[PDB]
Each structure stands twice: as structure tokens, then as C-alpha cells.
């Protein structure tokens, strides 16, 4: 199952924050600067 | 000094040597070239243990703890401010004009 | 704040009194461990070389690489 | 509640004077830990369905519980849907509300709807969410589109390939799966490397954004010495009235 | 363990691994205390508090395919899982080999 | 690509790969970096209980500033943009710098050697670790609301009295959060039973009489 | 060189999202780790936009630069 | 302190009813195991087997440090954090770094977990200020994630699927696993609602 994925969760958090009526936690901006490690393209 | 730099509006644009020339211009602010806070602390620690620098025991700048802290701050700085304002006319009248 | 490091040093000594020019916190912990009066919640400096290795690992995680080009 | 943590004064309480009064069921532990003190918008509850379900614990013990599907949502763009079963009605509503807040999602209300047709399908239910300038759907789908804030949208649900087309969770599940799979214009423009206003607006220098990047010495005709910038020849940069 | 006109093995089996026992562990208000209350590292890892399987979330699904479709993946590691790893109780020990001895 | 940056990263990974290459008195650049970091941490460190109290107070101040930004955006109805995030992060960083400047005095009193200074520092550490808010923040909120609601002579007097006192930059939303909180009945009841005796009991009986009179 | 050219490119309107997508393609797809020239060429282009999200991206890039063992210099402060 | 308060309540109850019951021990087992120090120790023993000089390991180190700090702050729940951790662990870069640290011989993972205990003491990632060193001793002297040669707990959820296929003998070859309902006689209380797991028996 790929519906529970750190990239999908980061995308969900980003489009949740982009409304302007949700306050981001610290790990959202700290994961924008340090993205999760991918298994693809290797 | 830190209350005078906050209202100067040119202090971020000045170097360390210009501010040390404006404030003291003596051996106390001269470093003998890298200038930082910890170099001044390492110099004044060795000046304290020699004992050419005398330091009052206890925080002379008090805030954040008690609601009356600026009164305790001014009570710890009356002597140094009065000596700073009175020894320069004392050194002037020592010259016997 | 926009303070000069000379003014930052003056404010540092004004905040800490004569304790800024005395022993450090690690030297106070060493004296409290040697005299025997150290509380239970404090971390004892039991080994010097292994604490040095721990600090060197934690500082080597931030140590810059050499980008100078000969 | 926007204040989960802070200064806890001894002489003062934790509530305020001008506080909105709670409901008979509304408890502060409904919103989970990761979303507590985060939502800046008030939500409104809409009940999809109540049902009675026989729940088996033992071979000699069968209870009759109540199963509730609902969705919470605010017109500012954040909504979620949930479903839960419980021995009573209010406990099923509370557990479905905390499930809906656990599975909450959001979209972009820059254009108040989609900008490309989204045809998605779960197992059997096929739902299309297309752009429009009105809201065109039935009332059960128009209420969810108002829960998301999609005023300029259209939605169409086909339930013929489902095993039970009369199930009430299929409609809200399909609408939430279609709105979840919708990309915003800014997201597509950032993924392509474009500005978003070049993707929706009819202005002619946006045609410059369509083609690939080519050199200005290559598109303009050369001079006597070779390739030349078009701003280095006097007759191009100087206007004709001077 | 008080037996109560039953074999103690089957009584502890019904009190540990039956469906009302794990539903009482999750919280259902069953008749009277179908699960064991006080267990430390002897608690099964299926019914731990930090585990990713909760029967209260699974009661709303009437089919096993809906449980395989909609439920979250289970939590892999917990404190009880750490204690069973330190004890080596993640897999049972191999019994005596009955493949080639006899059928007595 | 064998360039200066790539070869520098390669020899850095080769140095830090094993244990043998990066210990003491082996590499002068890493020893100089560790020496400068330890020189920096020699002056800017506290006692461990002072560090725990500073961590608790920093968590409380950060939560209070975030609640102030939440109250402002809930009252105005505006959205949370990156500009409000930048403003909130700058306010939190300035407040944490001010809290370091405050707790430097508590660390100096805790390591001074006097009985009264160490006793007051232990009182401050115990008040911070239990989660109890400071009286200085209450006084700051009260004098900020007094500065807000005074006339120009009183405003100039308060601004000239506290221009040199190191006050933290407090938003109006913090003062509004402190002021609009309801007061506790049990604490005022205990205070009126401790300050006044049987007259306090008679006054609280009359207050409960007025309460159950307004109930009817 | 591509990010340096995109920092001054005024031929089209989409130079900043193209630079953002090129940095993301270099880091995530190509597998290259950004050094000081990549961070400098990206921060010089992000410092030109007065939008607060691009300024936040520039601040987060400077913080990731100082966290990854690359100290700040005169170009970073500039 | 709620753990000492629950211990006081346990002592008062065991002195009241004069026996060791099941309710009080379950209460103090729930109170003494509310800490999230297990997942923080997972992230820090994954950070310990990394390389302080390699930039890829610096990215993995900062990612897992941010993950552990977000778990300790309570802003991120446990299940999504476990998804982030198993996505960071299953990557071939982290596994290659762990293989290089195994091929070294003078590995820096002991200083890694020691600095991890010091960081968990300093940043307030524990319940007691000196409990991280006892937890370090527990990780060292017992079978745990610290004695695994790659730095994660040895469950099959933290290992890759293409390595899971040739070793283990599962249901069918050539997610949540269930017993299909063709087995009408599997065990006494076993059925289709009883899940099974590949590399462990949680029963």
C-alpha cells in the first residue's frame, strides 16, 4: 500500500497548511529542508 | 553601552574597531587580528585574575525575576556611574588650571 | 539584538557578575564529584577520554568539509 | 480550542469570559493530539447516515449497536469524513467525529473548485469532478462540496458497478476520494516549472511560456560579425519617434 | 487461577484468546471481566496497548475484505515487543522432532 | 567528477569513517574546531537544573507566543501565511534570547556560593520545573495594559521609567489572553480564608447566600 | 551554470519555478548533493522575490546549509 | 511526577487490600510504559550506525533527529512516525552505510549510542534526567536494536521485501496478512479475523 507514504503524508500536510487556516508543526518545515530518503532512481 | 547602541541607528554599520575607539580607546578595549565577544571575555578573565580588573560579585543587570528589578539594577550602578561622571572633573581639577 | 560583541561581552559580565570569570560549569561538576557532594539528577563526569570522544562525535556531525581548491 | 498549552495561572481559570458555549456532546478530546490547537476555522457537522447493526461478541451474545457515518467540514477549505459504531447514538457520533478529524484533508480555494476533470473510481463507484462556474450536483453531493468550499465545481457519481448501490457511505467516500486526488493549479505549475497564471488566463505573452527556452541571439537575425544581442543594435532599442 | 468447574488450561485459553476477552481489553463493557487484568511481560503481543490492531476499529467492518482494505498497517515495534525480543519470545522454541521417532 | 569539493567530501568521509582518524591530537583542523566549540560552550553553558528550568520556561514562552498569534488570526479572520510564520519565529527567537539573558542571572546566583542567592535560585528552578508561571510576566502584562489605557502624561512616565529596564517585546494578544481569563473561585476563597479569619467565613457565607439567591 | 543563468534569466516569466524544479530534480532524481555553489546560486535567485514563501525558502536553505557542515561566508550573508 | 504518584497509589492499595491484585499492577504497568523513549531510542540507534563525514548520512541523521524531536514534542503521532522510520531504514543508502560500518571493524556505533544518551539527557527526551543512561545499559547488555548489526530492531517490517521473499516461507510466492476462511478448523480460537505476521508470533 502506497497510500500511507511519507511523501504522500508530506503532500497532505502541505495542502493542509496551504489553506491558511491550519498552523504547521515544526516537522513540516523541518522536512521541507530535510526530505525523506527515497528508494527510487537508484 | 548596550543602551546607547540600541538608539544609535549606525551601530550595525560600524566595525568592532570603530565602536571600541568610540567607547574606550584605551588598553582595556584594545586587542593585540580577530575581534569577537569571547576574545574580550578571555582577555578580561586574565585581567581579573591578575588582579588588574575588578568585577563586582553578583548580577548588576537584573531583569526577569522580580517585578521590581530596575530598582535593584539602578542600586547596583549608582557607584560606577557617579565615579564615571565625577573622576573626569577630579582629573581635570588635578591638573590645577 | 544589534549589539556589538564588545557590548555583548560587557552585557555578559553585567548579567553573570564575577561568576563569568570563575570556573566553568564543567569544573563545578568536577569539584562536586571530587568532593562527593553531587546530586542524583546530575550527570557525573566519570571518564574524560570517553566524554571527549562523545563530544568529538557530536561536533564531527557539524564539522565542515574542505572546499579549498589547489 | 486554540489553547492546549500555555501559562497556567493559579489565581485564574483555564477558560475565558467571552467563550463560545459547548454542546451537550462536545468534549475537548475529540480532536486528536497532532491536530489539537491547529485549526483556525470552526467546523460544522453533517450526518450522512445512522444504522442499526447486530454485533457479535460471543456465540450466545449478540448486541444491537448503532453505526454512524458523517463528515465535518468548514467552508474555508478543510473537511474530513468518518464512520464508527457504538452502543449508543451520541457515542457513535463522537467516535465518528474523532475519526473524521483523524482523516481530515484540505484543498486549494484559489479558484473555488477544480480546473481539470478528475475521473476517479473506487471499487465500483465512479465519480467525476469537473470544473464549472456553478455548483451542479445533487443535494447530498452539493452539501459535501459546500463542506469543502467548492462553489465552482460539478460532480457526478455512478454507482451501478457497486455490489450495494444503496449504501450511504459510497457517495461521501467517492466524493472525498475525488477531491483528495485533485491537484491544485499552483501544485501543477510548481511541478512543471511554470507560473500558475500562465495556465488559466488568456494573455498573449503567456505564449512565451509555452515554448522551450532558446537563445536571444539564435531567434533574432545576426549581424555582419556573427551573433548579436537584439538590444545592442541602436535601431531596435531606440523608439521610432526619437 | 480459580478454575470454576472447568479445566484450567481451557479456562486460561478462553480468558486469554477468545473474542470477548480481547474486546474487553479494547473496552466493550462485556458481562464480567473476560480477560486477565494484571499481566506484565507475560501479556500476548497481539493485545498490547501500543500495538496496531484494535478490535473497536474493526467492529464497523462486516467483511474481512473491508478490514484488509480500510484498516491502517499495524505498529511493528512496542515496549512489550522489546521485552519479548530481549527474552527471545518472538517465536516459540522448537519441540522434540516427531517426524521420525514413532507414533506411540 | 574529481574536484576540490568532491575530494574534500571523500577525505572527510574517509577521516570520520572509522574511530582511529578523528581522536584527540590527530588532526589539527578538527582539534581547532572542537577547541573553538568548547571555548564557546565554556561561557554560554548553565547548570543542569538551570538548563531544565530554562527549557520549561522556554516551552511555556513559545507556547504563549504561538497562542498569541492564534488569537490574533482568530480575531482578525486572516490566513496563516509565510509572513506570519516568519514574524512568529522571530518573536520566539527574540523571547528565547531574552530568556537566556534572564536565566544567566539565575545560573550566576545558583553558582555564586551565597546561601540566599542559591536559595532564591533553587526557588526559581523549582517554580519553573513544576510549571508555575512567573510573577514578572504577570507584572509585565499588568503594566502593558496600564500603558495601553493611560493618558499621554502617564504613558510618557511609564515609557520613560521602563526605557532602560530590559522588558520583553510583548504583543497585545498576550495581554488580552491574560486579561480575558476568568478568575478561580477556590484560590480567592482560600486567600480570603487565610487573610481574614471568621469574618472571611461570614463574608463567604454572605457571598454564597447572594449566589443561591441569584440562582432563584 | 544552469542555476546561475536562471538567476538572471528575464526571457520568460517562469525562471523561479524552473529553478526550484531543477534543484528538486538535481537533489531527488539525479542523486546529487548540493554544495556551496548550488546553495549560492539558488539563494541568489530566491533573494530576488519579495514573496514571503520564497524568502522562507531562502531562510530554510541557509539553515540547511549551516546544518550540513557548510559555514556561512560573505556571499551567504549577502 | 505521575509515575511516583502511581507507585504511591499502588503501595497504598496493596497495603489496603493486603494482596497483589490485577487492577493495580495493570494501572502501574500502564503508567510506567507511557513514555515514547522506545521510538526515540530506535531513531538514535539508527543514527548511531551512520557516518559523520558522509553527506548522505548527514541527511539521514538530520531526518531521523527531526523525526525523534517531533515524536518527543507530541506533534506527530506514532504510526506515521513508524512509517517515516521504516521508509528511512529500508533505503539502500542507509543499508550500504551499515554494511560499510560492519566492514570497518573499529565501528563508531558505541560512541554513537553514548552521544545519543547524552543528547536525550540534554534535550529533555526522557522522563527522568538520568534514565537515558540506564536505557543505554539496557540496550547494550540485552538483546535489542543496539546489538543488531544494521541498527534497527530485527523485525521483517524493517527489512526489504526482495530480501524477505527468498528467505521466509509465507503463504504464497510466485501489508496486513489474514487467514482466508477456507480453514474452518485452524485452532481453538483462530479464525479469519485473526491476523498473522511473517517473522513473529505475537500470541
PDB file of N, CA and C in Angstrom, chain F residues 50-100:
ATOM      1  N   UNK F  50      19.460  24.491  36.069  1.00  0.00           N
ATOM      2  CA  UNK F  50      19.171  25.764  35.416  1.00  0.00           C
ATOM      3  C   UNK F  50      18.796  25.539  33.956  1.00  0.00           C
ATOM      4  N   UNK F  51      19.435  24.563  33.302  1.00  0.00           N
ATOM      5  CA  UNK F  51      19.089  24.241  31.920  1.00  0.00           C
ATOM      6  C   UNK F  51      17.700  23.618  31.820  1.00  0.00           C
ATOM      7  N   UNK F  52      17.324  22.787  32.797  1.00  0.00           N
ATOM      8  CA  UNK F  52      15.982  22.205  32.800  1.00  0.00           C
ATOM      9  C   UNK F  52      14.912  23.262  33.057  1.00  0.00           C
ATOM     10  N   UNK F  53      15.177  24.181  33.990  1.00  0.00           N
ATOM     11  CA  UNK F  53      14.244  25.273  34.229  1.00  0.00           C
ATOM     12  C   UNK F  53      14.126  26.215  33.046  1.00  0.00           C
ATOM     13  N   UNK F  54      15.246  26.471  32.360  1.00  0.00           N
ATOM     14  CA  UNK F  54      15.213  27.282  31.148  1.00  0.00           C
ATOM     15  C   UNK F  54      14.442  26.584  30.037  1.00  0.00           C
ATOM     16  N   UNK F  55      14.565  25.257  29.934  1.00  0.00           N
ATOM     17  CA  UNK F  55      13.822  24.517  28.918  1.00  0.00           C
ATOM     18  C   UNK F  55      12.321  24.567  29.180  1.00  0.00           C
ATOM     19  N   UNK F  56      11.918  24.440  30.449  1.00  0.00           N
ATOM     20  CA  UNK F  56      10.499  24.528  30.794  1.00  0.00           C
ATOM     21  C   UNK F  56       9.946  25.930  30.539  1.00  0.00           C
ATOM     22  N   UNK F  57      10.695  26.964  30.943  1.00  0.00           N
ATOM     23  CA  UNK F  57      10.256  28.337  30.712  1.00  0.00           C
ATOM     24  C   UNK F  57      10.241  28.690  29.229  1.00  0.00           C
ATOM     25  N   UNK F  58      11.180  28.145  28.452  1.00  0.00           N
ATOM     26  CA  UNK F  58      11.215  28.389  27.016  1.00  0.00           C
ATOM     27  C   UNK F  58      10.040  27.727  26.317  1.00  0.00           C
ATOM     28  N   UNK F  59       9.676  26.515  26.750  1.00  0.00           N
ATOM     29  CA  UNK F  59       8.496  25.846  26.210  1.00  0.00           C
ATOM     30  C   UNK F  59       7.226  26.631  26.519  1.00  0.00           C
ATOM     31  N   UNK F  60       7.115  27.153  27.748  1.00  0.00           N
ATOM     32  CA  UNK F  60       5.938  27.938  28.117  1.00  0.00           C
ATOM     33  C   UNK F  60       5.861  29.254  27.344  1.00  0.00           C
ATOM     34  N   UNK F  61       7.000  29.930  27.157  1.00  0.00           N
ATOM     35  CA  UNK F  61       7.002  31.201  26.434  1.00  0.00           C
ATOM     36  C   UNK F  61       6.725  31.005  24.947  1.00  0.00           C
ATOM     37  N   UNK F  62       7.265  29.931  24.358  1.00  0.00           N
ATOM     38  CA  UNK F  62       6.992  29.620  22.958  1.00  0.00           C
ATOM     39  C   UNK F  62       5.523  29.279  22.742  1.00  0.00           C
ATOM     40  N   UNK F  63       4.934  28.505  23.664  1.00  0.00           N
ATOM     41  CA  UNK F  63       3.510  28.196  23.580  1.00  0.00           C
ATOM     42  C   UNK F  63       2.655  29.445  23.747  1.00  0.00           C
ATOM     43  N   UNK F  64       3.080  30.375  24.608  1.00  0.00           N
ATOM     44  CA  UNK F  64       2.309  31.599  24.817  1.00  0.00           C
ATOM     45  C   UNK F  64       2.360  32.514  23.596  1.00  0.00           C
ATOM     46  N   UNK F  65       3.519  32.598  22.937  1.00  0.00           N
ATOM     47  CA  UNK F  65       3.632  33.423  21.733  1.00  0.00           C
ATOM     48  C   UNK F  65       2.834  32.812  20.581  1.00  0.00           C
ATOM     49  N   UNK F  66       2.873  31.480  20.446  1.00  0.00           N
ATOM     50  CA  UNK F  66       2.072  30.819  19.418  1.00  0.00           C
ATOM     51  C   UNK F  66       0.577  30.981  19.679  1.00  0.00           C
ATOM     52  N   UNK F  67       0.167  30.944  20.952  1.00  0.00           N
ATOM     53  CA  UNK F  67      -1.229  31.199  21.293  1.00  0.00           C
ATOM     54  C   UNK F  67      -1.624  32.645  21.025  1.00  0.00           C
ATOM     55  N   UNK F  68      -0.683  33.582  21.175  1.00  0.00           N
ATOM     56  CA  UNK F  68      -0.955  34.977  20.837  1.00  0.00           C
ATOM     57  C   UNK F  68      -1.184  35.156  19.340  1.00  0.00           C
ATOM     58  N   UNK F  69      -0.367  34.492  18.517  1.00  0.00           N
ATOM     59  CA  UNK F  69      -0.550  34.556  17.067  1.00  0.00           C
ATOM     60  C   UNK F  69      -1.865  33.889  16.658  1.00  0.00           C
ATOM     61  N   UNK F  70      -2.222  32.784  17.329  1.00  0.00           N
ATOM     62  CA  UNK F  70      -3.513  32.134  17.098  1.00  0.00           C
ATOM     63  C   UNK F  70      -4.679  33.050  17.446  1.00  0.00           C
ATOM     64  N   UNK F  71      -4.569  33.782  18.560  1.00  0.00           N
ATOM     65  CA  UNK F  71      -5.630  34.697  18.969  1.00  0.00           C
ATOM     66  C   UNK F  71      -5.766  35.861  17.995  1.00  0.00           C
ATOM     67  N   UNK F  72      -4.638  36.375  17.496  1.00  0.00           N
ATOM     68  CA  UNK F  72      -4.673  37.461  16.515  1.00  0.00           C
ATOM     69  C   UNK F  72      -5.325  37.013  15.212  1.00  0.00           C
ATOM     70  N   UNK F  73      -4.947  35.832  14.715  1.00  0.00           N
ATOM     71  CA  UNK F  73      -5.515  35.359  13.458  1.00  0.00           C
ATOM     72  C   UNK F  73      -6.950  34.871  13.605  1.00  0.00           C
ATOM     73  N   UNK F  74      -7.363  34.558  14.835  1.00  0.00           N
ATOM     74  CA  UNK F  74      -8.766  34.131  15.071  1.00  0.00           C
ATOM     75  C   UNK F  74      -9.639  35.385  15.194  1.00  0.00           C
ATOM     76  N   UNK F  75      -9.090  36.470  15.756  1.00  0.00           N
ATOM     77  CA  UNK F  75      -9.847  37.711  15.883  1.00  0.00           C
ATOM     78  C   UNK F  75      -9.964  38.430  14.545  1.00  0.00           C
ATOM     79  N   UNK F  76      -8.872  38.487  13.778  1.00  0.00           N
ATOM     80  CA  UNK F  76      -8.913  39.192  12.503  1.00  0.00           C
ATOM     81  C   UNK F  76      -9.572  38.368  11.406  1.00  0.00           C
ATOM     82  N   UNK F  77      -9.507  37.043  11.497  1.00  0.00           N
ATOM     83  CA  UNK F  77     -10.040  36.190  10.456  1.00  0.00           C
ATOM     84  C   UNK F  77      -9.123  35.980   9.274  1.00  0.00           C
ATOM     85  N   UNK F  78      -7.882  36.451   9.349  1.00  0.00           N
ATOM     86  CA  UNK F  78      -6.944  36.337   8.247  1.00  0.00           C
ATOM     87  C   UNK F  78      -6.345  34.932   8.190  1.00  0.00           C
ATOM     88  N   UNK F  79      -5.570  34.689   7.141  1.00  0.00           N
ATOM     89  CA  UNK F  79      -4.939  33.396   6.931  1.00  0.00           C
ATOM     90  C   UNK F  79      -3.521  33.382   7.492  1.00  0.00           C
ATOM     91  N   UNK F  80      -3.015  32.174   7.727  1.00  0.00           N
ATOM     92  CA  UNK F  80      -1.639  31.978   8.180  1.00  0.00           C
ATOM     93  C   UNK F  80      -0.757  31.861   6.944  1.00  0.00           C
ATOM     94  N   UNK F  81      -0.030  32.927   6.633  1.00  0.00           N
ATOM     95  CA  UNK F  81       0.898  32.938   5.517  1.00  0.00           C
ATOM     96  C   UNK F  81       2.313  32.670   6.021  1.00  0.00           C
ATOM     97  N   UNK F  82       3.280  32.742   5.104  1.00  0.00           N
ATOM     98  CA  UNK F  82       4.678  32.611   5.491  1.00  0.00           C
ATOM     99  C   UNK F  82       5.194  33.851   6.207  1.00  0.00           C
ATOM    100  N   UNK F  83       4.554  35.003   5.995  1.00  0.00           N
ATOM    101  CA  UNK F  83       4.955  36.223   6.689  1.00  0.00           C
ATOM    102  C   UNK F  83       4.627  36.147   8.174  1.00  0.00           C
ATOM    103  N   UNK F  84       3.454  35.603   8.514  1.00  0.00           N
ATOM    104  CA  UNK F  84       3.101  35.410   9.916  1.00  0.00           C
ATOM    105  C   UNK F  84       3.974  34.349  10.571  1.00  0.00           C
ATOM    106  N   UNK F  85       4.380  33.327   9.810  1.00  0.00           N
ATOM    107  CA  UNK F  85       5.305  32.323  10.326  1.00  0.00           C
ATOM    108  C   UNK F  85       6.680  32.923  10.593  1.00  0.00           C
ATOM    109  N   UNK F  86       7.147  33.799   9.698  1.00  0.00           N
ATOM    110  CA  UNK F  86       8.420  34.488   9.894  1.00  0.00           C
ATOM    111  C   UNK F  86       8.371  35.413  11.105  1.00  0.00           C
ATOM    112  N   UNK F  87       7.255  36.133  11.272  1.00  0.00           N
ATOM    113  CA  UNK F  87       7.077  37.015  12.424  1.00  0.00           C
ATOM    114  C   UNK F  87       7.029  36.229  13.731  1.00  0.00           C
ATOM    115  N   UNK F  88       6.321  35.095  13.734  1.00  0.00           N
ATOM    116  CA  UNK F  88       6.225  34.264  14.930  1.00  0.00           C
ATOM    117  C   UNK F  88       7.569  33.639  15.286  1.00  0.00           C
ATOM    118  N   UNK F  89       8.334  33.204  14.278  1.00  0.00           N
ATOM    119  CA  UNK F  89       9.649  32.626  14.540  1.00  0.00           C
ATOM    120  C   UNK F  89      10.629  33.678  15.049  1.00  0.00           C
ATOM    121  N   UNK F  90      10.552  34.903  14.516  1.00  0.00           N
ATOM    122  CA  UNK F  90      11.414  35.978  15.001  1.00  0.00           C
ATOM    123  C   UNK F  90      11.065  36.371  16.432  1.00  0.00           C
ATOM    124  N   UNK F  91       9.767  36.404  16.759  1.00  0.00           N
ATOM    125  CA  UNK F  91       9.351  36.724  18.122  1.00  0.00           C
ATOM    126  C   UNK F  91       9.763  35.633  19.103  1.00  0.00           C
ATOM    127  N   UNK F  92       9.663  34.365  18.690  1.00  0.00           N
ATOM    128  CA  UNK F  92      10.074  33.253  19.543  1.00  0.00           C
ATOM    129  C   UNK F  92      11.586  33.270  19.761  1.00  0.00           C
ATOM    130  N   UNK F  93      12.360  33.580  18.714  1.00  0.00           N
ATOM    131  CA  UNK F  93      13.815  33.642  18.848  1.00  0.00           C
ATOM    132  C   UNK F  93      14.250  34.801  19.742  1.00  0.00           C
ATOM    133  N   UNK F  94      13.586  35.956  19.618  1.00  0.00           N
ATOM    134  CA  UNK F  94      13.897  37.094  20.480  1.00  0.00           C
ATOM    135  C   UNK F  94      13.525  36.813  21.933  1.00  0.00           C
ATOM    136  N   UNK F  95      12.389  36.143  22.158  1.00  0.00           N
ATOM    137  CA  UNK F  95      11.994  35.790  23.517  1.00  0.00           C
ATOM    138  C   UNK F  95      12.912  34.735  24.125  1.00  0.00           C
ATOM    139  N   UNK F  96      13.427  33.806  23.315  1.00  0.00           N
ATOM    140  CA  UNK F  96      14.362  32.820  23.850  1.00  0.00           C
ATOM    141  C   UNK F  96      15.719  33.439  24.153  1.00  0.00           C
ATOM    142  N   UNK F  97      16.143  34.425  23.354  1.00  0.00           N
ATOM    143  CA  UNK F  97      17.350  35.176  23.689  1.00  0.00           C
ATOM    144  C   UNK F  97      17.173  35.952  24.988  1.00  0.00           C
ATOM    145  N   UNK F  98      16.002  36.573  25.171  1.00  0.00           N
ATOM    146  CA  UNK F  98      15.716  37.282  26.416  1.00  0.00           C
ATOM    147  C   UNK F  98      15.631  36.331  27.606  1.00  0.00           C
ATOM    148  N   UNK F  99      15.127  35.113  27.399  1.00  0.00           N
ATOM    149  CA  UNK F  99      15.088  34.135  28.481  1.00  0.00           C
ATOM    150  C   UNK F  99      16.477  33.616  28.829  1.00  0.00           C
ATOM    151  N   UNK F 100      17.368  33.494  27.839  1.00  0.00           N
ATOM    152  CA  UNK F 100      18.763  33.176  28.138  1.00  0.00           C
ATOM    153  C   UNK F 100      19.423  34.290  28.941  1.00  0.00           C
TER     154      UNK F 100
END
